[PDB]
């Protein structure tokens, strides 16, 4: 587990599983839009199951106040993942809370994100984004499954 900025917040909704092909670019989700006054945290949980003959490396990281240059439950696909579609370079995305989904090693990553806003209480404002970037392209031998699924689980924490 990784706690965003070391501050605890004070059901199990499962979104659709995106398919990771050999030429995919990335995906991102906005919160709390994806689950559709307000004050609540979250517990993001991403799992990527694949055989031992596959290789790759994902990079899941939150990004508060992620403006672009309302997807919904389905999500969206980035166009230029090198500049994160917002001008900021991908090579320094590690500043924000993050995790690695190295397929040679553990295939699960969970992030605890508390409430981060300039007002104590808040439907038109999206707090933070959740980016999944295939830093290392996925490869396999012929005859294996051509698509490796990824599952995202969202659990509200300390809602009010």
């Amino acid at each position: 587990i990784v706690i965003a900025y070391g501050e605890w917040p004070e059901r199990f909704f499962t979104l659709d599983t995106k398919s990771w092909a050999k030429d995919s670019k990335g995906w991102y989700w906005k919160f709390p839009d994806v689950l559709t006054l307000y004050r609540s945290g979250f517990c993001v949980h991403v799992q990527c199951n694949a055989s031992k003959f596959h290789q790759g490396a994902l990079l899941v990281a939150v990004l508060p106040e992620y403006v672009l240059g309302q997807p919904g439950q389905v999500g969206a696909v980035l166009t230029h993942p090198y500049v994160l579609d917002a001008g900021i370079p991908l090579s320094q995305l590690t500043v924000c809370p993050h995790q690695w989904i190295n397929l040679r090693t553990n295939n699960c990553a969970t992030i605890i994100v508390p409430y981060m806003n300039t007002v104590p209480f808040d439907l038109n404002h999206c707090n933070f984004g959740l980016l999944v970037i295939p830093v290392v392209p996925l490869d396999f031998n012929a005859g294996a499954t051509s698509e490796i699924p990824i599952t995202v689980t969202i659990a509200p924490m300390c809602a009010e």
């Binding site: 403006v67 240059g69 230029h80 001008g87 900021i88 320094q92 300039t118 038109n124 404002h125 999206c126």
Partner: protein, 197 residues
């Protein structure tokens, strides 16, 4: 020691923020002006501070002349002046400062002015953080016979920053939102010829 890289020192040494030429004018306060300071501020998401402005005035060619001026500050909610002889120049709710040209520059501060608790350089939703507006004119009913140009210097004091974010490398296009040139993306680093050297 480590005091040379603190957040307070990193946002000091007041520099030029805008230049105005009057051969009345309105200049709204906007830190997201010159790209040198915009990239430095864009490092963090939430910032809280106050400013301290200084107006050095002089005619072109540099010579000074005994003329009387009036710099007027407008809070975020107020009607901005629209003429040389409007009632805005006379209403007393918004303060103003009088100083002659042949005098030391007028130094004035401005507190942390926002309904929220910190400025937001990045807003994801739809409609907010206006800081005010300065108005400059030459006092008198007749027309002044001398052209003036003044440059505004601004400092930052009592700086607090939150939620660091990655820096920016692509060139800027607009002063309000971050669109880049999505067809000629420039790489961050330089280029070698073969990865052995």
């Amino acid at each position: 020691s480590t005091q040379e890289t603190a957040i307070g020192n990193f946002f000091s040494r007041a520099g030029l923020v805008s230049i105005i030429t009057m051969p009345y004018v309105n200049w709204d306060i906007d830190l997201m002006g010159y790209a040198q300071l915009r990239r430095k501020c864009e490092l963090f998401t939430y910032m809280r501070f106050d400013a301290e402005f200084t107006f050095v005035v002089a005619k072109p060619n540099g010579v000074l002349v005994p003329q009387l001026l009036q710099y007027m500050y407008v809070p975020p909610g107020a009607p901005k002046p629209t003429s040389r002889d409007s009632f805005a120049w006379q209403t007393a709710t918004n303060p103003s400062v009088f100083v002659k040209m042949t005098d030391p520059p007028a130094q004035v501060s401005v507190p942390f002015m926002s309904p929220a608790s910190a400025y937001q350089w990045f807003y994801d939703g739809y409609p907010n953080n206006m800081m005010g507006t300065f108005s400059i004119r030459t006092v008198g009913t007749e027309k002044s016979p001398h052209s003036i140009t003044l440059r505004v210097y601004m400092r930052i004091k009592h700086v607090r920053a939150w939620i660091p974010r990655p820096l920016r490398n692509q060139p800027y296009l607009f002063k309000t939102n971050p669109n880049y040139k999505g067809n000629d993306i420039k790489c961050t680093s330089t280029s070698r010829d073969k990865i052995t050297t």
